[PDB]
Symmetry: C2
Subunit: 303 residues, 2 copies
């Protein structure tokens, strides 16, 4: 578990000052899966600090506050990214506790870590156990067991529903994942746009799907930064793969989409209100956008 893991950690570091800092440390889509955790602690924490880090930048540039007073979550997959793993071993050298996420126990990750959780990974897998949700629970537990977290139950309601919603949204989306793939097939360049705690999924959809699995060109525009430069490349030929969030930055998302609809032309909207996410409670819904989009988008990407 992550609860017990945080408990052992709280207890162990208790005598040194306890846990004051959380670092998420991974590569690309592992770096990106941890964006919700970062957004969570930045919004919710009153005393914890957070940092999300690329495992290459982490290994070559560790923060000084990498202590026994910090905790360090790292993900890989196979568990073999001499960078994720340089990281988990520079941490222990610093005596920071270290959670590991991986799919593959045998890996030299799981022999370099102070603990190790797994995650679900596979077709028709349980999402409540996915890499992203173990990132997020690691954050909610760190908060809950240190300062307390006012909406803990809600989060766990949220988490109870993110298999129904996702898989029952994944298949609602040949609705359009046909048309989409037809329309954009030949475009050399496609933008993603996104904000809030779900932003990381957009980022993943550029670097990992389009711009490396489709040899395509893409970038991720912050739906709020978009009005301070990006804005200007809006043609009627420019394709935007738009991620419309549920939660506190849906207003930000909306102002972007108004513009793009009344000035742009070719915008593939993927709307989480539309996919039945408001089943999750407003107090916490922000943190589930990523798990939705990240699990739907492969339907478009396959097509």
């Amino acid at each position: 578990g992550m609860k017990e893991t945080v408990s052992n950690i709280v207890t162990s570091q208790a005598e040194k000052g306890g846990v004051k800092h959380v670092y998420y440390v991974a590569c690309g889509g592992s770096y990106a899966a941890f964006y919700p955790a970062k957004a969570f602690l930045e919004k919710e924490a009153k005393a914890l600090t957070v940092g999300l880090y690329n495992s290459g930048e982490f290994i070559n540039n560790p923060p000084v506050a990498l202590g026994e007073n910090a905790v360090v979550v790292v993900a890989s997959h196979k568990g073999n990214t001499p960078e994720t793993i340089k990281a988990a071993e520079i941490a222990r050298q610093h005596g920071a506790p270290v959670i590991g996420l991986t799919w593959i126990m045998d890996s030299p990750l799981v022999a370099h870590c102070d603990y190790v959780e797994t995650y679900t990974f596979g077709d028709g897998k349980d999402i409540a156990g996915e890499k992203t949700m173990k990132g997020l629970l690691s954050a909610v537990e760190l908060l809950q067991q240190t300062e307390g977290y006012a909406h803990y139950d809600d989060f766990q309601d949220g988490v109870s529903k993110i298999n129904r919603i996702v898989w029952r949204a994944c298949e609602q989306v040949a609705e359009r994942a046909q048309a989409f793939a037809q329309e954009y097939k030949d475009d050399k360049v496609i933008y993603t746009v996104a904000s809030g705690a779900g932003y990381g999924a957009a980022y993943l959809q550029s670097i990992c799907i389009f711009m490396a699995m489709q040899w395509i060109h893409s970038a991720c525009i912050h739906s709020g930064e978009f009005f301070h430069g990006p804005f200007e490349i809006t043609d009627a030929n420019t394709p935007f793969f738009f991620q419309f969030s549920e939660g506190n930055t849906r207003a930000v998302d909306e102002r972007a989409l108004n513009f793009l609809k009344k000035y742009g032309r070719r915008i593939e909207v993927v709307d989480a209100a539309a996919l039945g996410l408001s089943t999750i409670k407003t107090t916490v819904i922000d943190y589930f956008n990523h798990s939705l989009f990240n699990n739907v988008y492969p339907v478009y990407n396959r097509a």
Copy 2:
């Protein structure tokens, strides 16, 4: 920043001290605060820092927005609607605000418990620039709370940057020409970066390639036939840059090198926080040589 940060350590040590630092701005200025943020992340054990787009901060502010948190806005002309509502909100949760601007009568300034400016314009001073002020807010809050071990070494970095840059501007000028002639056909150019440089490559992306030229770009992070404007940084991520450049080289690439441009005169301990000031001030050399090879006044907006 030293006086401004000292008034603050004073004002607030009463109400609990300074725990949280929040840099909030839109676009270019957002990008200018990036080294700052990376300084704290790297350097601090007590203090917290967030870097937020004004639009997101106003719609979803942190609950730690309070008397123990300092909010640092920024606005060149000094009147972005978002950034101002952020400086409003912060005041109305007891947070000391600090405006960074070029226009000291701007409607932002009616909303800023202190204000500072920087050098700007043609042929400015790089020890005075918006980013170096943003960056010294960071080094002063860290020093005047929990201490900065390499504070002296930083003050020496400040000593040399102005002139490293005026050399590197005139160093890149012949090369800009060539660049300009290759890339003026291209409708897509990536920038590449890592470290407390990453703010520069991002602005290069969104603020000049996109806004000014209508060129499609992304800022791709090292860690994470095609052109690449490639920022080979110095310092602690030089290795991560190196290993990216290998891919490109081994497998249409304008490498701009912080070490070839003469950075290393700054000490290893602080060199990381000076890539942005360089890259930011070398770039316009490339950009005008680009604008005129295209037929596109950097002045060209078609909206705001």
